Design a binder for this molecule. Structure first.
Ligand code: PAV
Ligand code: MET
Ligand code: ZN
Ligand code: ZN
Lengths: 172, 167
């Protein structure tokens, strides 16, 4: 409810961190959602097995690097377009702090030796327990480290009024 | 989900709502993450295009029916296993309130007439704008209404010490 942002995916750079939305709780705590954009929109997508395995690993490793000093992660979830994840948290860490934690978590993916070190990979604890690939998760993580992580600007990427009009007044 | 309840997927009923996590905030507010389980674990899955199209519709429709009266949705995002969505929100609505909102939102999906009506479905606003199917999204929605929405219990579904040892 403070700011959410309509940004232009045709100009979006990746890998990148961007503040997607800021909200406040009734007693005034800040909640921030970050766009952790792994793939360039409409050019690249993550594979379904590797995104799922990465999901099992990512929020744990992000918590290890990012929690504390005014930040408590709520959830990290995949985007339905398979180009990134949204991470919701209590606090207002800056984008570079988030990027650095993200890269450290990617590096942590690469030291996963085998599937027995993937948390919850079994029929009791995973909804689709065959839909997994450590090697694809590690390919994703390696890609992020090879490409580095940029900080994207909501001002730069903002869709102007006119364009949002053109798009929204085709939705009816 | 980070810091989740360790529940037994092999016994989880679906469609169902479940409290997946609760958190406090520094000045004392509450956050709740709900497991919106569409598919029976390891028996059914949603198709990738339909889940994506549903993601585009669901947030909006859910806010229509659920926001207000001590609740503000943060995010509704798909699960990587494609069996459900996690909904994070500020507040502590009961499970049945959430189930009622969810069904109303599914009914809303069914009145979408064409793909052009779907918010943000275009190259400017979607990361994978070809990966969409309104018909799959409506099939999903219809299945929820046909099956109804149960409330699942973390106490009922808790994995026992002996099983967690086995794991
Ligand atoms: C939405 C989703 O769960 O389905 C396809 C993608 O794999 C996903 O985002 O992880
Ligand atoms: C191991 S369950 C993890 C939930 C996941 N981080 C999501 O929010 O979709
Ligand atoms: Zn899983
Ligand atoms: Zn999309």
């Amino acid at each position: 409810l403070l700011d959410s942002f309509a940004v232009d995916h045709t100009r979006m750079q990746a890998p990148a961190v961007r503040t997607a939305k800021t909200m406040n709780t009734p007693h005034g705590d800040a909640i921030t959602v970050f766009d952790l954009r792994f793939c360039i929109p409409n050019k690249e997508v993550m594979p379904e097995k590797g995104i799922h395995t990465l999901e099992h690993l990512f929020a744990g490793f992000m918590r290890d690097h990012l929690n504390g000093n005014g930040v408590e992660i709520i959830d990290i979830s995949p985007m339905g377009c398979r180009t990134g994840f949204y991470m919701s948290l209590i606090g207002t860490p800056d984008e570079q702090r988030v990027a650095d934690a993200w890269k450290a978590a990617m590096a942590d993916v690469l030291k996963v030796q085998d599937q027995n070190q993937i948390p919850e990979l079994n029929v009791y604890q995973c909804g689709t327990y065959q839909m997994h690939s450590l090697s694809e998760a590690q390919d994703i993580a390696r890609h992020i480290l090879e490409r580095d992580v940029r900080v994207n600007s909501n001002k730069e990427l903002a869709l102007p009024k006119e364009k949002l009009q053109e798009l929204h007044i085709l939705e009816h």
